[PDB]
Amino acid sequence: SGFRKMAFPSGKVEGCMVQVTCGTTTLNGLWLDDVVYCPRHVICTSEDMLNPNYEDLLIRKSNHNFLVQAGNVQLRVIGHSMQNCVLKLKVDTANPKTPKYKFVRIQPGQTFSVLACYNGSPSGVYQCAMRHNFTIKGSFLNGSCGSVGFNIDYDCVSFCYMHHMELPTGVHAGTDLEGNFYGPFVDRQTAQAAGTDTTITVNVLAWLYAAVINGDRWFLNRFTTTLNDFNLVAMKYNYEPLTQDHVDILGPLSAQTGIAVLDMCASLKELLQNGMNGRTILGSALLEDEFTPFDVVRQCSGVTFQ
Amino acid sequence: SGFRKMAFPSGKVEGCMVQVTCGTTTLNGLWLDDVVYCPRHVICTSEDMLNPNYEDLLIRKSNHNFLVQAGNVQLRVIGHSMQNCVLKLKVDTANPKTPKYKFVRIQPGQTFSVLACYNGSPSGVYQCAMRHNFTIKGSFLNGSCGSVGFNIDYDCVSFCYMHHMELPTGVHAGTDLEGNFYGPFVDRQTAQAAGTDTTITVNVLAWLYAAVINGDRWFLNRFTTTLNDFNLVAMKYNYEPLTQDHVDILGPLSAQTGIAVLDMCASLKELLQNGMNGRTILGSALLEDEFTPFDVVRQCSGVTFQ
Ligand SMILES: *[C@H](O)[C@H](C[C@@H]1CCNC1=O)NC(=O)[C@H](CC(C)C)NC(=O)OCc1ccccc1
Numbered sequence: 230s231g232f233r234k235m236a237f238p239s240g241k242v243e244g245c246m247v248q249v250t251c252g253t254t255t256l257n258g259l260w261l262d263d264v265v266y267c268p269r270h271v272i273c274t275s276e277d278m279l280n281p282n283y284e285d286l287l288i289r290k291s292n293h294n295f296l297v298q299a300g301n302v303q304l305r306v307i308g309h310s311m312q313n314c315v316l317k318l319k320v321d322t323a324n325p326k327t328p329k330y331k332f333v334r335i336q337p338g339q340t341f342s343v344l345a346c347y348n349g350s351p352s353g354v355y356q357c358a359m360r361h362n363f364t365i366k367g368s369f370l371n372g373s374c375g376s377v378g379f380n381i382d383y384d385c386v387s388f389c390y391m392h393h394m395e396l397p398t399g400v401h402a403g404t405d406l407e408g409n410f411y412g413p414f415v416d417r418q419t420a421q422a423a424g425t426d427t428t429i430t431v432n433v434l435a436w437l438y439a440a441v442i443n444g445d446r447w448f449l450n451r452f453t454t455t456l457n458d459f460n461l462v463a464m465k466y467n468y469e470p471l472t473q474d475h476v477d478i479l480g481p482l483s484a485q486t487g488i489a490v491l492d493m494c495a496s497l498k499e500l501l502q503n504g505m506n507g508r509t510i511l512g513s514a515l516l517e518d519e520f521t522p523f524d525v526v527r528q529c530s531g532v533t534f535q
Numbered sequence: 536s537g538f539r540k541m542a543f544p545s546g547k548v549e550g551c552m553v554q555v556t557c558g559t560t561t562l563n564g565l566w567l568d569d570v571v572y573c574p575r576h577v578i579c580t581s582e583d584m585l586n587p588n589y590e591d592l593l594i595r596k597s598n599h600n601f602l603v604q605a606g607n608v609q610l611r612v613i614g615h616s617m618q619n620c621v622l623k624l625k626v627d628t629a630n631p632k633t634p635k636y637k638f639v640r641i642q643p644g645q646t647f648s649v650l651a652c653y654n655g656s657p658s659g660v661y662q663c664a665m666r667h668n669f670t671i672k673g674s675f676l677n678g679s680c681g682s683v684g685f686n687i688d689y690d691c692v693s694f695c696y697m698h699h700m701e702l703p704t705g706v707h708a709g710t711d712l713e714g715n716f717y718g719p720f721v722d723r724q725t726a727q728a729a730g731t732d733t734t735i736t737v738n739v740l741a742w743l744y745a746a747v748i749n750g751d752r753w754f755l756n757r758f759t760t761t762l763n764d765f766n767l768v769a770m771k772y773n774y775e776p777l778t779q780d781h782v783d784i785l786g787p788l789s790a791q792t793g794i795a796v797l798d799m800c801a802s803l804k805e806l807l808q809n810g811m812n813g814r815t816i817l818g819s820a821l822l823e824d825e826f827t828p829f830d831v832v833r834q835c836s837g838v839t840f841q
């Protein structure tokens with residue numbers, strides 16, 4: 230028993246991280262087969278960051294201007310192209326450590342592990358969620374761009390995120406591996422607004438099920454509710470409206486615990502309206518929303534990877 | 536910016552995990568050079584767990600009774616011995632993936648990454664602290680024993696923990712890699728008492744410095760205090776007494792932030808006496824104590840590993 234914010238094992242991704250330097254700017258790239266993916270802002274100078282014309286900037290760049298380093302070994306760049314906000318640097322050597330992989334664009338509420346890197350070397354690994362305002366709450370310093378977010382299913386790495394920037398609120402924004410930003414964000418140094426940060430209701434519910442499984446049950450109350458009645462309380466607390474799909478997704482945890490989804494909704498309503506009265510649930514003094522139903526089953530049933 | 540419970544990258548340790556089976560019991564072993572380390576309870580049956588005589592049980596065991604599997608490949612066991620609560624299974628093949636490593640016995644308040652494994656395969660990675668009562672707050676199911684806790688300094692893996700058991704309180708106990716338990720715990724299925732769980736004061740202070748660095752400053756107040764005056768308030772809230780060594784350890788964060796350690800103590804005193812009034816510090820609604828001063832500098836300055 231016990232419940233922790235658990236990241237995927239990072240080894241398969243560690244073997245894909247390289248360093249990409251263009252002039253004075255150094256960041257991280259992802260080396261899959263004979264291609265290195267990195268943020269296109271690698272080509273920017275301190276001047277260029279306010280309002281870069283990425284097309285004009287890139288024209289002044291040839292293959293030999295991209296220094297690509299795997300450990301202490303230099304890769305030879307034989308091609309380069311821009312896809313949305315990422316560069317694809319074609320190298321003459323296939324990564325011998327390429328795992329089975331997919332590029333996936335994930336949905337708000339879904340979670341992933343981040344391998345934070347500097348100069349193509351791993352610093353650390355942590356779990357994040359794509360929030361409803363298409364931000365993540367990460368830990369990123371200068372040089373961290375090109376750090377990736379991923380899931381593992383068995384032996385397959387699903388890359389969903391590449392790090393590009395930090396907003397005024399101290400939260401983080403980036404792209405899928407096709408270089409399309411999550412949310413309305415653009416890769417230029419201008420004040421950009423994350424909108425309302427709504428709580429991922431289905432994920433809070435998942436986590437209350439995790440708590441019940443681990444013997445933390447104080448908050449189970451005597452009431453039930455309806456989707457429409459629960460959602461009136463959700464709107465007030467900036468919670469995502471609960472839908473029958475969410476109820477269906479919680480079906481296995483509901484069936485495992487014998488606690489009906491709408492009875493757990495009723496418990497959640499009283500926690501939102503009454504607070505926690507100085508108590509904790511799974512060692513937490515607020516309602517956690519960065520565990521999916523899948524994450525809870527995965528953690529509470531010991532699912533493993535290659 | 537931003538601050539997360541960050542684990543070390545796990546790849547170097549992933550390549551050391553094997554599966555160890557003795558009769559019907561399967562758990563994880565650590566394969567370093569030509570030696571596999573695992574919990575000695577691998578030799579127990581369901582009967583044996585209440586009051587095992589480990590010496591008598593082991594006598595009925597030969598090399599060929601220990602099935603050691605690295606992925607889908609069988610290792611040949613050419614020797615076996617008990618060291619305290621671990622078995623060392625000598626194999627005829629040196630692990631080709633052995634990293635540079637040390638066995639360290641860590642001190643309460645120190646933190647480490649756990650690679651939770653089942654059947655010798657990684658499930659996930661998370662950060663833990665050795666608590667003052669020599670327990671950890673992990674996530675462990677049946678089959679997780681032999682999972683290890685570690686730190687990385689550059690290219691060297693320092694193994695500090697091997698998982699053996701869960702107490703009534705839902706917290707976790709285990710050994711160093713010499714097989715000596717942290718705390719008074721023994722490897723038998725009997726109600727065992729973790730004592731008072733004191734908060735790691737120096738670690739709370741470290742985390743308040745992390746908060747100030749990341750722009751969360753609401754809790755900085757107008758007061759200072761003395762070690763003796765602070766510690767009177769610590770004892771009441773079951774906080775570890777603060778010492779000049781702790782003050783010295785916080786010296787770099789104090790010097791970086793220009794907030795004197797005893798002024799931060801005064802801020803901590805008011806948080807303990809007044810609570811947080813429904814506010815958060817670095818997204819947390821309680822005082823976090825599983826970040827060391829080193830962890831804070833490491834995270835806030837981007838220290839990387841091989
Ligand atoms: C990529 O290495 C870098 C990551 C930033 C640096 C601080 N925290 C992060 O997440 N990205 C940028 O510097 C980005 C570049 C533009 C061309 C998009 N600009 C940015 O994020 O501006 C905010 C900022 C910069 C430096 C320190 C703190 C915030």
Ligand SMILES: *[C@H](O)[C@H](C[C@@H]1CCNC1=O)NC(=O)[C@H](CC(C)C)NC(=O)OCc1ccccc1
Pocket residue numbers: 230562576579584675676677678679680681698699700701702707721722723724
């Ligand atoms: C090692 O695989 C296993 C880990 C336990 C299982 C549940 N959570 C854990 O951390 N250790 C044991 O089963 C241990 C064996 C003795 C010979 C020391 N006994 C134990 O931890 O008893 C408590 C327990 C067992 C099963 C489920 C929940 C609690």
